[PDB]
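Schema walkthrough. Field components (list of strings):
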Amino acid sequence: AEKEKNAAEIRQQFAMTAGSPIIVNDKLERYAEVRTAFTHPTSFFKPNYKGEVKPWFLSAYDEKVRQIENGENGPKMKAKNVGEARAGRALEAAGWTLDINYGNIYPNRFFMLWSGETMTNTQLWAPVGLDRRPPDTTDPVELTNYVKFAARMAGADLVGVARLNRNWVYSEAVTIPADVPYEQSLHKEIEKPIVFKDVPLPIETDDELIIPNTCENVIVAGIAMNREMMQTAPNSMACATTAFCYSRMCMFDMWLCQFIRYMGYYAIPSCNGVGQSVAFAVEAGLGQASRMGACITPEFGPNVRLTKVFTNMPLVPDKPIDFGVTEFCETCKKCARECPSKAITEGPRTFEGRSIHNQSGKLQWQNDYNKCLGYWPESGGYCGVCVAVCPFTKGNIWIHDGVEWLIDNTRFLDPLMNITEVWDGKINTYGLDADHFRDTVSFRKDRVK
Amino acid sequence: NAAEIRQQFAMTAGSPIIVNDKLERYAEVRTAFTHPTSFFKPNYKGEVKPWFLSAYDEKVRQIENGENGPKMKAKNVGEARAGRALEAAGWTLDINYGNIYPNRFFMLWSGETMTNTQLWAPVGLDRRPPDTTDPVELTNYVKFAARMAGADLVGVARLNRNWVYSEAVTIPADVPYEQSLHKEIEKPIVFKDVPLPIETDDELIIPNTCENVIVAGIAMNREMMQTAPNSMACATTAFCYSRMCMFDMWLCQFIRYMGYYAIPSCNGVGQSVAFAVEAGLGQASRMGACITPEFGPNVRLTKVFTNMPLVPDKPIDFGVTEFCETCKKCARECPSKAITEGPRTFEGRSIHNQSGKLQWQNDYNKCLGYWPESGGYCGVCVAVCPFTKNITEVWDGKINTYGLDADHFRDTVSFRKDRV
Ligand SMILES: Oc1cc(Cl)c(Cl)cc1Cl
Ligand SMILES: Oc1cc(Cl)c(Cl)cc1Cl
Ligand code: SF4
Ligand code: SF4
Ligand code: SF4
Ligand code: SF4
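Field assembly_structure (string):
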């Protein structure tokens, strides 16, 4: 008979021995955040459908407007009618409500404060003194159980702990000056170094963002996206599950940082800022790096967002996981074949970046992320076709042979041997799926060993 | 199958709340949280303070004494601290315990100044007339969005103005957060022939076109609520308040980007239990909460008011009134004897009740008096209610995302057939 799926068993079977799995060489340097395709001058500008050269997201806006006017949900994808086209973009736009300028990347601004002292919640609770009282727990075993329980309350579907590897922290962040109001933010972005110094608390000066040398650990959260909506990539409903999860990321960071602070430690939120989430996620054991470049998890494949929190709270690092992703990506190449911009390489992993957007000196599949971003104004969205077509995104993949768990190779056969229906179809709270939600149930035994 | 149950128990259309000719709209300042007769309570040292500051003093005393609640020893001081840290953190996205000030902080009545609206302005979704006016399609769209936005239950009713507060508790618009608690004022909520929700110096003005209310249920965690009146029940309460706030903002933005207006509220603007009953989420109960089939009373409520055309849901009758008539378990377990064992009447027991509607009349000042004593938000009534069915074992035990339970999460799956 069918053995019922056991995500905890799977993770136990594929756990590695301790050690960062990412292979590096001597040309590795920390990466300036301005180099990402979203921010770098070489990639920031893209034509719209009229050939006008604009900040890429404004050219994408032009395409969203054009699609609604033409009753489309995506490029050359007719909607049922204009109202359906409208509704998909309204859902997408609303999803971003708790996120600043697509990703919350500016450290210590708006929602990403490095201290809780000015927050309305901290002020309201100040008489209790939780943020000023020294820790009552220093045992990393108990702290790991407490903080992972809090992480699940705060909306994480996956949570893991790693020692902080500074190689993945940006050398300089993209931010804005502290006196710049929101309306000017996109016009006044600057770079600012992230440095590690012997100070008691995270602090920002006029010149530097300063992380204490005591900042030992990073807590990584996975925020699951909705399968039915992502499968509409590159059309509007994939944009909406992306957007809603960014606001879930923001709430997670703020909730968890406040818990850590109220336990007597400090905590730095980040969302898409501060450092490279995929590397932290790999080192914390959420999953493995992949050909497309995302972290692939056993529960969700790559169809999961990441955020992370940095802290001096003593914790027990989790073990990395190896469930064969590298070997499957070596032979699969579905994302590379389906990518509308041919951004994903079909070749082997190297240590040499394809362009300025890649960090050289770590072994990975090297993709052209200017090509990727170039497709976003064209399609009017955040694409996601690679996530949608990846076999690991199917809910389907795990089988038990009577002895152990394995991946069903039939899902990788190539070839295998609409948005109205999404709006009319299955949904549940936060877009989670009750057919698989058991996979992320947690007891103490799987929070800390 | 929960969708079958809810259809089995649908009533004919029509508000099930029985009223008489005495009913009048209720001033929000009359709640026990705010009213001058109930606001000040002694702490354990005998010092009279705002009730929540006296409750703070009890939380500190409990942590120092390694306790999770009144007369409830924790495993150690570390565990006691962790429960209060979790509770305090849960409130991160909530202003002064409930977001009641309308059109302040997170509860803005227009989206125009929000950072998300400004970023999206070149698309013009909030300026573009609606492309959809069909209430059937809009009901399906907005309910799908409500589930994305974190509602475990969602219902629609016509707006009954009887449950809208006659006057809100708020603060002047330019008062900074740090002075808010000391500068709360009353302000009338009125309905007028105006295009958009608007606030003047003198009035909060809701348009006469504001036809509908969308009510969301936000499920609390059963294991944590069963620790009431101890700290982990406080924590699931607190986290759900921040889920409420996110829900309101997300859904208001969706409705605005569809071409309509939307008023968020959380614990402000009007009486959530009455809206929830009229929208079919559940039935009124002896303790005074809305009892749902999926969660009993262990669910929080929030609501959004809009002119978006929608199809009202039917109220539901699955026998709560007859069950509460003979049960009385909440009344017997209540640590303050706040809940009556008598029959329902139209006359309130005190200023905190709205007279003129048939309900079990409870003494809510007695309830609030137990909160500084116990250092929390009690919830024993919710915990012991049959419809709802130590702290170290909770921290070491089962949990899942947002505190939801995969053993029951299938009950809130939704398809178009059950949305409209
Ligand atoms: O990570 C992202 C960054 C930006 Cl700038 C956009 Cl528009 C969308 C996504 Cl998903
Ligand atoms: O509704 C509430 C209001 C207040 Cl003021 C507190 Cl402290 C707690 C709860 Cl649950
Ligand atoms: S589609 Fe195939 S090659 Fe691409 S990331 Fe997924 S498994 Fe790897
Ligand atoms: S998001 Fe789209 S364009 Fe970018 S790599 Fe994936 S498939 Fe290619
Ligand atoms: S919250 Fe506690 S004190 Fe208040 S009515 Fe319920 S049982 Fe009684
Ligand atoms: S405990 Fe009994 S009387 Fe009280 S609300 Fe629940 S069912 Fe009704």
